[PDB]
Design a protein around this ligand. Structure first.
Ligand SMILES: COc1c(NC(=O)c2ccc(NC(=O)c3ccc(NC(=O)[C@H](Cc4c[nH]nn4)NC(=O)c4ccc(NC(=O)c5ccc6cc(O)ccc6c5)cc4)cn3)c(OCCN)c2O)ccc(C(=O)O)c1O
Ligand SMILES: [Mg+2]
Ligand SMILES: [Mg+2]
Lengths: 402, 517, 517, 402
DNA sequence: GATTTTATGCCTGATTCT
DNA sequence: AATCACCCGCACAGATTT
DNA sequence: AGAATCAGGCATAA
DNA sequence: AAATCTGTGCGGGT
């Protein structure tokens, strides 16, 4: 039944794998350690034992083969966890949403049918990589997008990068890296809140000074700030946008109601700013970063890149040029799935006992886990819909601003 | 090795999968009423130049191109998606023109990829109209190597006319088809009065219109669905009882069946029912549909009445079906339950945006062309000094520098250049230094290069006049485009003209009959 | 219902099938040694621009293009044909460079079409050299829409180099590989002397040369095959006996195996033979072939003798095989049995034809270009009258008629034309009325049109000098081509130069060792 | 199991079809009269019973299924033609060489194993079409290539085409049709003798005046004749070849022969127009056609196509222009196999009792048929090779050409 | 993503008759 | 060359239990 | 003991 | 004799 059993008959040093698909199963069979490892490919999605009746579980072929392979019994008055084979169990599914779904199905099966196996800690999860980077001599694998971004940033600032501001200063490493990291963090904070405001306004307000509410007044001071902002926004346009502004008062503070129009005859009629926004911490950190980010460049300025020099303004394009220089001799490959990887890659990346990485599954609380399983994997649609709605993007819009 | 709790892993994985499926596979977009797979298939077929008046192509070519380039999923699903759009009995207005064995109403089968051919339909070119004029946005593919549209600049109300059906995690959508002329009339009525109520819209749109021309039995579910977005209707077949005198024989002739029903299953179910004696009064059953229409003949016993057995068949078998209307769609990347007025408003706003972007692009192109023609006309009026300067120069670069160095007098062509409305036909990116100065012209680098590319053939009179004619035509076009961008009323006139043209081109007649109980 | 006799139906059907299989499926062409499927695959890969220094393409795309355009047959046959050309252990000189898993000598099988990629090899571009200069005839494809070459203008002796194997109706063909340098030396020797006998040729071509570097046993069969066209040879494997003293026990090490022999089947057959006590003195068998090379180890019993068991292995096992040489090929669309001299003569005649046609095409192109260059020079000599005449032209046609119907003064350019006299550069199709008559040039219609399509950019001095340089070099090119066409020894000199260049570029060393019994 | 039975049970009104391929069988099953028609798809090529043994004939799957479907016995002492099901049998294979090979295999099986079935007339052959042509409104199917040529000729001369010689005559149909038919027949005759003469030499002779061998004798006009022929050949030569002539008076009638040097850089010895060529009827019909194809066109001439006009100066140019105009709104579909046809097309073409077309197979001589089967399908290679060589191109040299 | 046994002719080895 | 056995949500006959 | 007969292997096609 | 329970199929995915 597609099972390539191992030779080690002692059930204290064996391993078992549950590979997704047929090509990946064949590659694993080619690249395995023949001594104490076994391969059990799964062709497609398996039954959901939470919903299905007990009769159909025995009729299903996949779960029947899995139960036979494990060696333990099934059902009350027959289960016996002592008689176990393959003390180590690894999932090793793909790195996309369907792989996660299959993983959840397998976890539900194991937790509902064999609580003792999960409690004792015999179930593990593998972690194959996603990207492969090659740079002539330096080549390696990178997992997840965040690590790829970190690697790209590190390679961009791998030596050199002496920012000549006026005559000859030198941040020299740590200061520049800290500034870039803070700028990236603020960029991410801006992107997550991108829905509620335009990108241009948030990108431009950082350069502007603080609101200066201390000297604010109903006339001759409230208008100047908004007029300066609208002037600095209007002179940077490429899509036929237009910015207009107005202010109002409510006997406590003078609030702003800026408006913008682009490729539409309609108008939002308000992008209000009042005490609530300035009191928030997001604008505080924006101004904190903007304090360092000012017009520090003099008439002469450049970056002492490796055998290169690009004297220009608009440091964003300077960073883009640095990235282009970094990516000049870099090649990237993005694996589509486990089928792409040849047996040697699978052996050295996930199945090697001395260089693999895995995760152990354990249970913290029993009642909470049971309630979660009943809520998600049950056959009551309304609780599942409510749970998905509650953890939707509305709850993701965290206003901690830190 | 590092421990991880089961609850966190389960929560993260299942939420990720659900969020991917909700906005990735099932639900359609309200503006154009297409799922991602349909949009990718249509864009791939459009890029290949597989027009509606050219040769066919094998299905394997298109499926392989779609899988390799844009859509990284299985091939069977993509081929089934392509096959469904070419069936006359599935879509009210087909979007693909097919050739081969694509199946029949019995739901038998369809030939494999290597035995069929396809191309775009004539109506489909309306969905992708003005795609090259920066009317919509583009997004990267699954690996940052290609660009795919974010939404098509549709001109047909696709969602209402073709309907929708989809299953997701936690929700589902089901919308029936409609008729094109009624929907266009409703849209025009909405444009004429923006505070229109549901009754005014339903005066033009009585109800759905299925491809198979069944009978709708009821009038309350349609109103409930159009008012709240959820409802239920009953679709009934078409049948009649005829008497040929002689021996007082009665036979039942079935012509039209409901929507989404397999004829063979219905026939075999009736045969099974009469075999088990669950239905009394049925003697014989036959099918006689051959190349002209659908006919099913049922001969009844002499000791029974046709009406009773007909009502029993309506109550028991699949000759009457229940359709549950449930309108769910993506508004701004979030599921939402809508009604008729919301869909109409969304379509109108989409049209306004598309027309505005198209107008801006056309204005930019016209200004650039007028700018080039100004320099050409100025150069043609000073032939002798220009050729002398070119001859004396040793290299083209030196000639270009010499041309750009000094100003050039306007000559006899100053009448039309100064007749323009100041900056009507002046590109924005051009600096104020160049252009028509006080009594003299200053050339740019690209203008000089265009002058150097002029051929000796243009010195003839007709070629001299054609440039002036084109310049005046471009001035008129720029004035018209500026006037369109000026007010907010001309835009509605353009939209109404386009809608009326579409109605006159692609209109058709009604099929389904709506009747009371 | 027209009756028909069984005999005529059987006769016509079987004769049609047999002739089609004989002249369209199995046997190769003597001039280039390629079956029709190979030629179609190479042409399809060349038209797509899948060169040897570009990115790869998937196998499915190429296979689909071949099936759709040129080859109306299935996919498995085409894919297997493509796969067999990329295996280093099948062809002596590979024609396709493939990336993926194309099998291995152990007995594995290649992956599916969807998981592999291919492109042309460097040597393949020699087969399709000078294909665009009208060197070979084109024929219609099955549907009468496209054109396919009748034969490639090859530059490599592909038939002898790569051999062939095929089964037809009533006959079969089987030819082994050879070494490139030996074949080129034989061709050069034949060119030097056309009365060379087989004894002279065999000094330069000792015998076959397989990819796997086996041993060839005996020498009479090779001579008989090359003299009459039919023969037999014996291919023996390479093995030796090693003893490391100490225990004094020997082992048999096998490094190489014959041509077209599976390693796994050989090993399992040996295991089955030694299991049943059919071969005595064999204790253990092992395989250690990996990365570095091939090694098979046989440990014999302590009291046995290695030589006796080694000799028994050749008699019983598959370490020695028999190859039957049988040369059959198409000469002029008919099967025929060949020998070495006939193949060499056919290749030489093909090369002569190709070079002659190429020279004719080049001469025609040179004369046609020189005509227009003379026209442009004469026009530039008199720029001011030309532009003055054009300025008074109501339309281009009137200007062209005015230019055509008038003589022109040569000016200072006539001295250059003194070198072009004697009707050296005049096109053959040109009438005697036009051209220089009495020191005054005469223009034709096409020359006038070329003058009217002249840009101002070419009025500078450097652009004027370039035309004179081009004309001066074109005169020398015309003289060289005429001298090549004027004699027969120059053709043989060119052919010898090409052969020597090919030998220097693609030559390599020998692998197989030939020994007597 | 791969057999769609018919509901009719009387074994005298049923039929059996032996379709090639699985997709073709699937298409055919939908479009058939379910009452009294059965289908039996064949996946590929089938066993050759002439070379095989009886045990292997019983072992094979396709022939066993066919024997079970027919219902009669197999082998001696079991065969009984009276107990026959499906009293009509139709082959309906593809329209290419592989279809012909499978047809020959099926005929061999039927004749060798069931002589009485063939003798009594229970075997038929179907004739599916190849081309489908539509011209806006009309639509029709065309078999093979000759009918396509006839259809093209008819469409080209369909209305209008009133050829004007000087002012406004009108050939008006029949004369033009006869001239076109004679020209096509002469071209067909010329195209089949390319080995014995160059094509250009044969083409050039039709337009030149008749040699008039009767009154030639020894007037020494042969020199002017051959010189004019060579000059005309070289006037419009556009491939680099050259022509020369040689003459001699070895007999009373002076003889001449051309020598041609062609792109191969080798010169042929001669192509002598001996007494056979002048005395043959081929030259007589060529001269007869040339008599009608003299310089009939005047200084100005044109062709009167429907609502169109174009000047012409040669018969070939007029025919080419007419053919090009005829292909304006014409759509042609070519069927690569039975799998390309939807069920409606198959029904209306090959399976409709009142519009189909078939051939009945019958036996004329027994000994001749047996000898032919033994020679062609037997396992003796040399008689088959000799038979193929005898009917090869050496026997294709038919001197009639009419 | 992977799924059956046939035709056609020249060599061999394993096996069967007189 | 079309077929294998599971996930997701909504509405509906005929089959089991109170 | 030696003729006779039976299979499997190679490369493009259903 | 009211109320729970068990199956089938529509259209894009392993
Ligand atoms: C020959 O045709 C031609 C052509 N040709 C072409 O133009 C042509 C061109 C291109 C391609 N293709 C490709 O380039 C490509 C590229 C990439 C891929 N993908 C992959 O590699 C990846 C790997 C991977 C990722 N992760 N792990 N592995 N696969 C997958 O993600 C993947 C997807 C799905 C599945 N399983 C299922 O869904 C499935 C189902 C049922 C189940 C049932 C069960 O019970 C259980 C399970 C089941 C599972 C498993 C894995 C694939 N193809 C092509 O191939 C076929 C296109 N259809 C072409 O034919 C043209 C003209 C003619 C003519 O006649 O003129 C013609 O004849
Ligand atoms: Mg995946
Ligand atoms: Mg075929």
């Amino acid at each position: 039944g597609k099972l390539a059993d191992c030779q080690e008959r002692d059930p204290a040093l064996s391993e078992l794998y549950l590979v997704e698909g047929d090509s990946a199963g064949g590659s694993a069979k080619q690249g395995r350690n023949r001594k104490n490892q076994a391969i059990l490919p799964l062709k497609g999605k398996i039954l959901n034992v939470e919903k299905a009746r007990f009769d159909k579980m025995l009729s299903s072929q996949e779960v029947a083969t899995l139960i036979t392979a494990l060696g333990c019994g099934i059902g009350r008055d027959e289960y016996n966890p002592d008689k176990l084979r393959y003390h180590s169990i690894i999932i090793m599914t793909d790195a996309d949403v369907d792989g996660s779904h299959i993983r959840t199905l397998l976890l539900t099966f194991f937790y509902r049918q064999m609580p003792e196996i999960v409690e004792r800690g015999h179930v593990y999860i593998a972690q194959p990589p996603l990207y492969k980077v090659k740079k002539g001599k330096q080549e390696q694998y990178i997992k997840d997008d965040e690590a790829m971004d970190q690697y790209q940033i590190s390679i961009a600032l791998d030596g050199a990068t002496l920012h000549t501001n006026a005559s000859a200063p030198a941040l020299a490493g740590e200061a520049l890296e800290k500034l870039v990291s803070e700028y990236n963090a603020t960029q991410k904070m801006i992107n997550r809140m991108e829905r509620r405001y335009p990108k241009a306004m948030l990108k431009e307000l950082i350069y502007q000074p603080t609101l200066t509410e201390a000297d604010l007044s109903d006339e001759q001071t409230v208008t100047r700030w908004v007029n300066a902002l609208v002037s600095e926004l209007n002179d940077k346009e490429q899509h036929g946008s237009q910015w207009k502004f107005d202010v109002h008062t409510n006997a406590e503070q003078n609030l702003f109601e800026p408006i913008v129009r682009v490729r539409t005859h309609g108008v939002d009629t308000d992008y209000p700013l009042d005490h609530e926004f300035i009191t928030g911490g997001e604008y505080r950190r924006i101004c904190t970063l903007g304090e360092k980010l000012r017009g520090l460049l003099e008439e002469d300025a450049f970056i002492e890149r490796g055998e290169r020099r690009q004297p220009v303004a608009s440091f964003e394009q300077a960073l883009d040029w640095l990235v282009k220089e970094s990516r000049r001799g870099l090649s990237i490959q993005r694996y589509k799935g486990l089928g792409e990887m040849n047996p040697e890659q699978l052996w050295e990346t996930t199945m090697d006992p001395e260089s693999r990485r895995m995760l152990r599954v354990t249970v913290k609380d029993a009642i909470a886990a049971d309630q979660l399983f009943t809520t998600l994997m049950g056959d009551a649609v309304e609780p599942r819909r409510a749970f998905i709605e509650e953890n939707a993007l509305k709850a993701a819009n965290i206003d901690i601003e830190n | 090795i590092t421990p991880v709790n089961i609850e966190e892993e389960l929560k993260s994985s299942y939420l990720d999968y659900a969020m991917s499926v909700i906005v990735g596979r099932a639900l359609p977009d309200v503006r154009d009423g297409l799922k991602p797979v349909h949009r990718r298939v249509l864009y791939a077929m459009n890029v290949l130049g597989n027009d509606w008046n050219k040769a066919y192509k094998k299905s394997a070519r298109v499926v392989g191109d779609v899988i390799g380039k844009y859509h990284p999923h299985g091939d069977s699903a993509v081929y089934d998606t392509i096959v469904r759009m070419a069936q006359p009995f599935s879509l009210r207005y087909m979007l693909v023109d097919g050739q081969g064995n694509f199946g029949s109403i019995d739901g038998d089968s369809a030939a494999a990829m290597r035995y069929t051919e396809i191309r775009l339909a004539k109506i489909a070119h309306e969905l992708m109209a003005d795609l090259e004029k920066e009317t919509v946005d583009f997004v990267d593919n699954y690996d940052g190597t290609e660009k795919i549209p974010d939404v098509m600049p549709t001109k047909i109300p696709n969602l209402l006319v073709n309907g929708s059906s989809g299953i997701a995690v936690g929700m589902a959508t089901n919308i029936p088809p409609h008729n094109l002329t009624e929907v266009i009339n409703g849209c025009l009525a909405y444009i004429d009065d923006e505070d229109i109520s549901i009754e005014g819209l339903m005066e033009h749109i009585p109800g759905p219109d299925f491809p198979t021309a069944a009978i709708i039995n009821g009038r309350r579910g349609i109103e409930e669905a159009y008012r709240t977005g959820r409802g239920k209707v009953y679709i009934r077949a078409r049948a009649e009882v005829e008497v040929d005198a002689k021996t007082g024989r009665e036979t039942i002739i079935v012509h039209e069946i409901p929507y989404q029903v397999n004829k063979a299953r219905l026939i075999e179910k009736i045969a099974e029912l009469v075999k088990e004696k669950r239905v009394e009064g049925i003697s014989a059953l036959r099918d006689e549909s051959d190349k002209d229409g659908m006919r099913i003949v049922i001969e009844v016993k002499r000791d029974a009445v046709g009406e009773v057995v007909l009502n029993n068949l309506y109550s028991q078998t699949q000759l009457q079906v229940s359709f549950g209307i449930n309108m769910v769609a993506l508004h701004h990347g979030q599921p939402k339950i809508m009604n008729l007025k919301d869909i109409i408003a969304a379509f109108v706003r989409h049209r306004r945006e598309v027309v505005t972007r198209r107008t801006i692009f056309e204005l930019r192109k016209a200004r650039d062309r007028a700018h080039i023609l100004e320099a050409l006309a100025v150069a043609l009026a000073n032939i002798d000094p220009i050729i002398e300067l070119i001859r004396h120069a040793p290299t083209p670069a030196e000639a270009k520098t010499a041309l750009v160095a000094n100003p050039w007098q306007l000559g006899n062509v100053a009448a039309m250049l100064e007749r323009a409305g100041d900056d009507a036909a002046r590109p924005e990116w051009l600096e104020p230094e160049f252009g028509v100065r006080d009594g003299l012209y200053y050339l740019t680098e690209q203008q000089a290069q265009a002058i150097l590319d002029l051929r000796l053939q243009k010195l003839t009179g007709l070629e001299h006049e054609k440039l002036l004619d084109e310049y005046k035509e471009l001035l008129d076009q720029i004035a018209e485009l500026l006037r369109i961008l000026g007010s907010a009323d001309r835009l509605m006139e353009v939209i109404r003209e386009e809608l009326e043209l579409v109605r006159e081109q692609f209109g058709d007649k009604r099929r389904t009959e709506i009747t009371a109980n």
